[PDB]
Design an enzyme around this catalytic site. Sequence first.
Site, PDB file in Angstrom:
ATOM      1  N   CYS A   1     -17.883  15.001 -21.076  1.00  0.00           N
ATOM      2  CA  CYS A   1     -18.289  15.573 -22.951  1.00  0.00           C
ATOM      3  C   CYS A   1     -17.634  15.772 -24.246  1.00  0.00           C
ATOM      4  O   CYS A   1     -16.910  16.832 -23.631  1.00  0.00           O
ATOM      5  CB  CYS A   1     -19.448  16.880 -22.114  1.00  0.00           C
ATOM      6  SG  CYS A   1     -19.884  17.399 -23.961  1.00  0.00           S
TER       7      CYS A   1
ATOM      8  N   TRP B   1     -25.835  18.899 -30.046  1.00  0.00           N
ATOM      9  CA  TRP B   1     -26.596  17.568 -31.144  1.00  0.00           C
ATOM     10  C   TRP B   1     -25.825  16.017 -31.801  1.00  0.00           C
ATOM     11  O   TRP B   1     -25.007  15.607 -30.874  1.00  0.00           O
ATOM     12  CB  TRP B   1     -25.958  18.176 -33.007  1.00  0.00           C
ATOM     13  CG  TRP B   1     -25.153  19.024 -32.963  1.00  0.00           C
ATOM     14  CD1 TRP B   1     -23.460  18.216 -33.083  1.00  0.00           C
ATOM     15  CD2 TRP B   1     -24.693  20.559 -32.244  1.00  0.00           C
ATOM     16  NE1 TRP B   1     -22.225  18.616 -33.098  1.00  0.00           N
ATOM     17  CE2 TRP B   1     -23.144  20.272 -32.893  1.00  0.00           C
ATOM     18  CE3 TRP B   1     -25.119  21.346 -32.393  1.00  0.00           C
ATOM     19  CZ2 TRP B   1     -22.334  21.587 -32.485  1.00  0.00           C
ATOM     20  CZ3 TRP B   1     -24.432  22.235 -32.052  1.00  0.00           C
ATOM     21  CH2 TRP B   1     -23.091  22.539 -32.269  1.00  0.00           C
TER      22      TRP B   1
ATOM     23  N   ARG C   1     -17.392  19.812 -25.418  1.00  0.00           N
ATOM     24  CA  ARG C   1     -16.885  20.948 -25.109  1.00  0.00           C
ATOM     25  C   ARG C   1     -16.516  22.193 -26.208  1.00  0.00           C
ATOM     26  O   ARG C   1     -16.486  22.864 -25.464  1.00  0.00           O
ATOM     27  CB  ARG C   1     -16.375  20.899 -23.851  1.00  0.00           C
ATOM     28  CG  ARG C   1     -17.204  20.117 -22.948  1.00  0.00           C
ATOM     29  CD  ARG C   1     -16.533  19.536 -21.510  1.00  0.00           C
ATOM     30  NE  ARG C   1     -15.755  18.268 -21.930  1.00  0.00           N
ATOM     31  CZ  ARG C   1     -14.668  17.994 -20.911  1.00  0.00           C
ATOM     32  NH1 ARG C   1     -14.559  19.034 -19.715  1.00  0.00           N
ATOM     33  NH2 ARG C   1     -14.097  17.360 -20.992  1.00  0.00           N
TER      34      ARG C   1
ATOM     35  N   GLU D   1     -22.821   7.924 -30.962  1.00  0.00           N
ATOM     36  CA  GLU D   1     -23.778   7.648 -30.091  1.00  0.00           C
ATOM     37  C   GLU D   1     -24.969   6.708 -30.537  1.00  0.00           C
ATOM     38  O   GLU D   1     -25.904   6.036 -30.044  1.00  0.00           O
ATOM     39  CB  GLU D   1     -24.293   9.155 -29.307  1.00  0.00           C
ATOM     40  CG  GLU D   1     -23.282   9.954 -29.249  1.00  0.00           C
ATOM     41  CD  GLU D   1     -24.076  11.134 -28.660  1.00  0.00           C
ATOM     42  OE1 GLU D   1     -24.483  11.102 -27.486  1.00  0.00           O
ATOM     43  OE2 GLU D   1     -23.665  12.034 -29.179  1.00  0.00           O
TER      44      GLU D   1
HETATM   45  C1  HEM Z   1     -23.387  20.363 -28.548  1.00  0.00           C
HETATM   46  C2  HEM Z   1     -23.112  19.091 -29.352  1.00  0.00           C
HETATM   47  C3  HEM Z   1     -22.515  17.645 -28.229  1.00  0.00           C
HETATM   48  C4  HEM Z   1     -22.261  16.584 -28.164  1.00  0.00           C
HETATM   49  C5  HEM Z   1     -21.555  16.471 -29.923  1.00  0.00           C
HETATM   50  C6  HEM Z   1     -21.925  16.204 -27.106  1.00  0.00           C
HETATM   51  C7  HEM Z   1     -21.614  14.588 -26.959  1.00  0.00           C
HETATM   52  C8  HEM Z   1     -21.263  14.279 -25.814  1.00  0.00           C
HETATM   53  C9  HEM Z   1     -21.034  12.404 -25.575  1.00  0.00           C
HETATM   54  C10 HEM Z   1     -20.860  11.423 -27.049  1.00  0.00           C
HETATM   55  C11 HEM Z   1     -21.725  12.339 -24.789  1.00  0.00           C
HETATM   56  C12 HEM Z   1     -21.320  10.751 -23.961  1.00  0.00           C
HETATM   57  C13 HEM Z   1     -22.148  10.400 -23.843  1.00  0.00           C
HETATM   58  C14 HEM Z   1     -22.745   8.895 -23.883  1.00  0.00           C
HETATM   59  O1  HEM Z   1     -21.830   8.267 -24.820  1.00  0.00           O
HETATM   60  O2  HEM Z   1     -23.720   8.666 -23.420  1.00  0.00           O
HETATM   61  C15 HEM Z   1     -21.943  13.665 -23.478  1.00  0.00           C
HETATM   62  C16 HEM Z   1     -21.994  13.065 -22.774  1.00  0.00           C
HETATM   63  C17 HEM Z   1     -22.038  14.771 -22.306  1.00  0.00           C
HETATM   64  N1  HEM Z   1     -22.726  15.999 -22.373  1.00  0.00           N
HETATM   65 FE1  HEM Z   1     -22.069  16.610 -24.504  1.00  0.00          FE
HETATM   66  N2  HEM Z   1     -22.247  16.543 -26.727  1.00  0.00           N
HETATM   67  C18 HEM Z   1     -23.193  18.057 -26.987  1.00  0.00           C
HETATM   68  C19 HEM Z   1     -23.052  18.661 -26.241  1.00  0.00           C
HETATM   69  C20 HEM Z   1     -23.467  19.183 -24.169  1.00  0.00           C
HETATM   70  C21 HEM Z   1     -24.260  20.369 -23.569  1.00  0.00           C
HETATM   71  C22 HEM Z   1     -24.679  21.367 -24.619  1.00  0.00           C
HETATM   72  C23 HEM Z   1     -24.230  19.999 -23.082  1.00  0.00           C
HETATM   73  C24 HEM Z   1     -25.062  20.764 -21.639  1.00  0.00           C
HETATM   74  C25 HEM Z   1     -25.369  21.832 -21.624  1.00  0.00           C
HETATM   75  C26 HEM Z   1     -24.058  19.012 -22.607  1.00  0.00           C
HETATM   76  C27 HEM Z   1     -23.718  18.140 -21.390  1.00  0.00           C
HETATM   77  C28 HEM Z   1     -22.851  16.720 -20.681  1.00  0.00           C
HETATM   78  C29 HEM Z   1     -22.614  15.867 -20.071  1.00  0.00           C
HETATM   79  C30 HEM Z   1     -23.416  17.084 -18.441  1.00  0.00           C
HETATM   80  C31 HEM Z   1     -22.388  14.870 -20.208  1.00  0.00           C
HETATM   81  C32 HEM Z   1     -22.259  13.892 -18.861  1.00  0.00           C
HETATM   82  C33 HEM Z   1     -23.608  12.739 -19.236  1.00  0.00           C
HETATM   83  C34 HEM Z   1     -22.919  11.561 -18.857  1.00  0.00           C
HETATM   84  O3  HEM Z   1     -22.299  11.627 -17.895  1.00  0.00           O
HETATM   85  O4  HEM Z   1     -23.613  10.658 -20.015  1.00  0.00           O
HETATM   86  N3  HEM Z   1     -23.624  18.178 -24.083  1.00  0.00           N
HETATM   87  N4  HEM Z   1     -22.383  14.451 -24.360  1.00  0.00           N
HETATM   88  C1  LIG Z   2     -26.608  17.317 -25.422  1.00  0.00           C
HETATM   89  C2  LIG Z   2     -25.710  15.784 -25.797  1.00  0.00           C
HETATM   90  C3  LIG Z   2     -25.355  15.977 -26.602  1.00  0.00           C
HETATM   91  C4  LIG Z   2     -25.153  14.647 -26.812  1.00  0.00           C
HETATM   92  N1  LIG Z   2     -24.703  14.567 -28.390  1.00  0.00           N
HETATM   93  N2  LIG Z   2     -25.048  13.408 -26.156  1.00  0.00           N
HETATM   94  C5  LIG Z   2     -25.324  13.362 -25.191  1.00  0.00           C
HETATM   95  C6  LIG Z   2     -25.436  12.003 -24.119  1.00  0.00           C
HETATM   96  O1  LIG Z   2     -25.390  12.788 -22.644  1.00  0.00           O
HETATM   97  C7  LIG Z   2     -26.123  11.812 -21.825  1.00  0.00           C
HETATM   98  C8  LIG Z   2     -25.524  10.657 -21.994  1.00  0.00           C
HETATM   99  C9  LIG Z   2     -26.173   9.494 -21.164  1.00  0.00           C
HETATM  100  C10 LIG Z   2     -26.283   8.256 -21.440  1.00  0.00           C
HETATM  101  C11 LIG Z   2     -27.103   7.522 -20.534  1.00  0.00           C
HETATM  102  N3  LIG Z   2     -27.663   5.788 -19.872  1.00  0.00           N
HETATM  103  C12 LIG Z   2     -28.357   5.279 -19.943  1.00  0.00           C
HETATM  104  C13 LIG Z   2     -27.970   4.227 -18.477  1.00  0.00           C
HETATM  105  C14 LIG Z   2     -27.327   4.476 -17.668  1.00  0.00           C
HETATM  106  F1  LIG Z   2     -28.304   5.253 -16.535  1.00  0.00           F
HETATM  107  C15 LIG Z   2     -26.119   5.688 -17.514  1.00  0.00           C
HETATM  108  C16 LIG Z   2     -26.397   6.788 -18.629  1.00  0.00           C
HETATM  109  C17 LIG Z   2     -26.614  10.115 -19.806  1.00  0.00           C
HETATM  110  C18 LIG Z   2     -26.682  10.983 -19.479  1.00  0.00           C
HETATM  111  F2  LIG Z   2     -27.075  11.238 -18.450  1.00  0.00           F
HETATM  112  C19 LIG Z   2     -25.446  11.966 -20.945  1.00  0.00           C
HETATM  113  F3  LIG Z   2     -26.291  13.386 -20.092  1.00  0.00           F
HETATM  114  C20 LIG Z   2     -26.140  15.028 -24.831  1.00  0.00           C
HETATM  115 CL   LIG Z   3     -28.394   9.390 -27.020  1.00  0.00          CL
END
Ligand code: HEM
Ligand SMILES: Cc1cc(N)nc(COc2cc(CCN3CCC(F)CC3)cc(F)c2F)c1
Ligand SMILES: [Cl-]
Lengths: 402, 400
Positions: B104, B276, B107, B281
Amino acid sequence: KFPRVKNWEVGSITYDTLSAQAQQDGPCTPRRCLGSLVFPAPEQLLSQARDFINQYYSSIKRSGSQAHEQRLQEVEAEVAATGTYQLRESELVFGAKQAWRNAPRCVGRIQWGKLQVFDARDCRSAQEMFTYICNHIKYATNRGNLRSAITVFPQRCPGRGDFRIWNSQLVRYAGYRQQDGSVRGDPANVEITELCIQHGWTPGNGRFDVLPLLLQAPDEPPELFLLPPELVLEVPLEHPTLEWFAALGLRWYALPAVSNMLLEIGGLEFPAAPFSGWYMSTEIGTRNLCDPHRYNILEDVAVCMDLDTRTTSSLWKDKAAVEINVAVLHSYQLAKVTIVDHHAATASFMKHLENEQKARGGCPADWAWIVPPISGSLTPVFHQEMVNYFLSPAFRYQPDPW
Amino acid sequence: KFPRVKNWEVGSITYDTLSAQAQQDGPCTPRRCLGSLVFPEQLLSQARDFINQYYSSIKRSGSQAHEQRLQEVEAEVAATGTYQLRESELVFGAKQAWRNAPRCVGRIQWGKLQVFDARDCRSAQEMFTYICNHIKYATNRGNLRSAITVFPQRCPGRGDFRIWNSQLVRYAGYRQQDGSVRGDPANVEITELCIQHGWTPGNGRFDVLPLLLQAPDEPPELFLLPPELVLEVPLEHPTLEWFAALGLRWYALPAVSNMLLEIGGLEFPAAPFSGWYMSTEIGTRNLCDPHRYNILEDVAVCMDLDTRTTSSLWKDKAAVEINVAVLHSYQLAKVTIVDHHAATASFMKHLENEQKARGGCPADWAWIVPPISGSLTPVFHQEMVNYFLSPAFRYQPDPW
Ligand code: HEM
Ligand SMILES: Cc1cc(N)nc(COc2cc(CCN3CCC(F)CC3)cc(F)c2F)c1
Ligand SMILES: [Cl-]
Ligand code: HEM
Ligand SMILES: Cc1cc(N)nc(COc2cc(CCN3CCC(F)CC3)cc(F)c2F)c1
Ligand SMILES: C[C@H](O)[C@H](O)[C@H]1CNc2nc(N)[nH]c(=O)c2N1
Ligand SMILES: C[C@H](O)[C@H](O)[C@H]1CNc2nc(N)[nH]c(=O)c2N1
Ligand SMILES: [Ca+2]
Ligand SMILES: [Ca+2]
Ligand SMILES: [Cl-]
Ligand SMILES: [Gd]
Ligand SMILES: [Zn+2]
C-alpha cells in the site's frame, strides 16, 4: 514443489523447475525479501567445472559421450596438478553466451545466442588490452549497426594480479565535480573522472566529454588510454517535432559496453571481460537523462514544452519524459544507430521467456529490472510473474579495483 | 543481520531493524526470490504479542492494565475457545494492519482511519446496512474519508461472514459468442454468480454489480446498491473534447471487500476498507491493462497517433492523457484523488516517519512504484525490504 508462475495478461501458468538448479544463494529469506536491493579450493572448483562441462556437452547434444567423459577426466587432472584449468575455446564461447542467458536483470536476452566472443586470454599488457578493446569497440559499433560482443581477458590465477578495466563502461561521459557541490557532465561518473585526472588525464569542461580508459594489467597501476574520437560513435539528440530540442545540445553514445563485471565460467573467474550490445531507449531517455541524480533534464524540457510544472497533477513529468524518449528513439533512428524501444524490447523478452521455458523449464528474471522505468504496465513483462535466482556461468559484480 | 537499505537518488543509507520482527514467512528463499508473485490455544501467543504491541503503543507496557487484559484473554480463550477485542484494540489493530500492508502506497494516512464496529451483526440484511453506512460515510459527497467496517470474527464451529465481491463497487463483465467481454473482464466470474443468484444483467460497460453478502451458514444474498449511493465520475479530458464521448466512467470509492483482517490471532473474513484512488489505478491499470478495459488503442486512434510502430511511444502518450483525463475529471467533480507523483512523495515521507517510529517499514517495491513513470517518482530509487508484520490484511480463498 516448483514456483508456480502466472502471466496475468493471458491468464497462463508455468512452473519454474529451473530454479531448483540455482547454486549461489541470493539475498532473500523466508523472513524478508531483498529483491529490490541493487547490490545485495579444489573440490568446489571441480564441482563447478564438472557442472559446466556437463552444461556444454548438453548444449551440443553429446551428453555421456566419450568426448564428454574425457573432457571431464582432463579437467580433473589439470585441477589436480595445477589447482586450476583452462577452458577450451568452444567452452569459452559457450560459457559467455550462457552467462548472458543467465543474467536475471537483462531484458535483451532474446539475443543471447548471437554474441561475438573475442578470446583475449593471451593478452599480456595494458597496451595489448587497449588494442583488444578498440577492436571490440570497432567490431561492436560497426558504424551504427551494433553487434553484441564480449572480449574475454585472461582468467584470474594464483600468484598474479587481475586484468581490470577501472571504467564501468568503455564509453562514459566525464562528470566534473563543480566547486559548489554540483556536477558538470554525468554525476554517475564523478569518481572515475577524478581517477582519470589523478592518473594524468587533462580534463575537459563539457557535459559530454568521453572519459579515457584506465586499464590495469596484472600487478600494475592503471594505465591511461584515450579512445580515438573516430571510434566513439555519438548521436546528437533532436526531437522529430520539437525543434528547440536540438538547441539543448544533448548527445548520447552509440555503444553500451559494460566493462567492470566479472565473468564466471565453470569456477574460473575472468575479472576483465567487457561486453556490449545496443541500447534500450529508456536507459538513455528516462534513466541517463531524467534521473534526478543523473543529467536531470526533465524540468527544463517540461518548461521548454510550456507545461504547467507548478502542480504534479498536470503530469508534466510524464509528458516531458515521453518526449525525451521520443527524441532518443528518433535521433538514433535518424543517425542509423541500432536502438530498441521498451515496448519492442519487452515483447522480445516475453518471447525469450517462452523459449527458455521449453528449453530449460524456467528463466531467472529480476522483475524490477525487466520492467522498464516508464510505462511499466503498458509492457507485457509487467503482468508476467518472474522468479529470480542465480545460475552459472554468470556475470557478477566485483569490488572496484581501487 | 539488519538489511542495509540505500536511496540511490540521495545516497542516504538506513538499516531496517523492524524486519527482525517479521511474524510470518514470505515466499522467498536464499535459492530464489518470488517477490513478484501476486499470491505467493496456541492462539494465545499471537493474542499475547498483539496485546504487548497495543500497550507498548499507548506506553502502558507491563502496567497493571496490561497484566489484566493478558489474564482476561487467557480466561476468555479457556471459556470460549476464542476471545473478543476491546473496541480500542480493534481500532489499533485495523490501523496497524493498514500500516503493515507492504503493497500500500497510501500509508502516510494510516493514523486517520474510521473504524466501524459491526461485530454485533447477524444476517445479510444487517451487513447491507452496515455497508451502505460505510459507503455513505466514506464517500462523503466526494470528500473521501478512509474507513473500515469490521464484521464478526471467525470462530470455531460457526460459519463466516463473507462479502463475495472483491470490491464494494465493481463494474459488470459479460461474455458473448465471440469470446470477448463487455464491461470489466476482471469481473466475469462474480458477474455470472450474481446472475445465477438472481440478478438481472444489464448490458452496459459500466453496470455496477450487486452485492453478494453471506452471513454464517446461509447462502449469499443479492443486494442492489441504491444508485444515489454509488458516486461515479464521468471521464473527460481538459483539452481532448472527444474524450468525453468515449463514455468512460469510474467510481469514486475504492473499497476492498474480500480480504481477511487478522488481529492478535483473531480473523475477520469480512472487514471491508476504503480510501481514495491514486489516479494510475484507474487510468493505467483499470482502463489500460490488456486484460481490463484495454482502451489504450481506442484513445490512441482518437489522438491520431502512429499506432503501427512501437517507437512512436503512442502507448505512452495515450496512457498519459488517460491519466490526465482521470485526474481532471475527479478534480472537476470534487472527488478525492491523488496522482502518482504526490502519492509516491507522501510514501517517501511515510518511510522516513516509520524509520524513526519503528526502525523500518515493510514495503513491496513492485507495488509501491507506480505502473507508469516509474523512475520519475522517488520510490523507484528507494531500496525496500518486504516482510510480514501483524496485525495484517491477508488474501483468503474465495467463498466458493
Ligand atoms: C487512502 C488512500 C489510499 C491509497 C491512495 C491507496 C493506494 C493503494 C495502492 C495503489 C495499492 C496497490 C493496489 C493495486 O494496485 O492492486 C494499495 C494496496 C493496499 N492497500 Fe492501500 N490505498 C489507500 C488506502 C488504504 C486503506 C484505508 C487501507 C486499509 C485500512 C489500505 C490497505 C491496503 C492493502 C491491504 C493493500 C494490499 C492489497 C494488495 O496486495 O493488492 N489502503 N493501496
Ligand atoms: C483501500 C484502497 C485504496 C486504493 N486506492 N486502492 C486499493 C487497492 O487495493 C487492492 C487492489 C487489488 C488488485 C486486485 N487484484 C485482482 C486480481 C488478483 F486477484 C490480484 C489482486 C487487490 C486487493 F486485494 C486490494 F486490496 C485499496
Ligand atoms: Cl481498483
Ligand atoms: C543486445 C542488446 C541488449 C539489450 C537491449 C540489453 C538490455 C539491458 C538492460 C536494459 C539492462 C538493465 C541495465 C540497467 O538498467 O542498469 C541490462 C542488464 C544487463 N545486461 Fe543486457 N542488453 C543487451 C546485451 C547484453 C549482452 C550482449 C550482455 C552480455 C554478454 C548483457 C548482459 C547484461 C547483464 C549482466 C546485465 C545485468 C547487470 C546487472 O546485474 O546490473 N546484455 N541489459
Ligand atoms: C550490454 C548492455 C546493453 C544495454 N542496453 N544495457 C546495458 C546496461 O547494463 C548495465 C547497466 C548498469 C547501470 C549502472 N548501475 C547503476 C546503479 C549502481 F551503480 C549499479 C550499476 C550496471 C550494470 F552492471 C550493467 F550490466 C548493457
Ligand atoms: C532501488 C531500485 O532497486 C533501483 O533503483 C533499481 C530498480 N530497477 C532498476 N531497473 C533497471 N533496469 N535499472 C536500474 O538501475 C534499476 N534500479
Ligand atoms: C506480475 C506482477 O508482480 C504483478 O502483475 C503485479 C506487479 N505490480 C503491481 N503493482 C500494483 N500496484 N498493482 C498490481 O496489481 C501489480 N501487479
Ligand atoms: Ca459462435
Ligand atoms: Ca494516423
Ligand atoms: Cl547506460
Ligand atoms: Gd514544432
Ligand atoms: Zn525476494
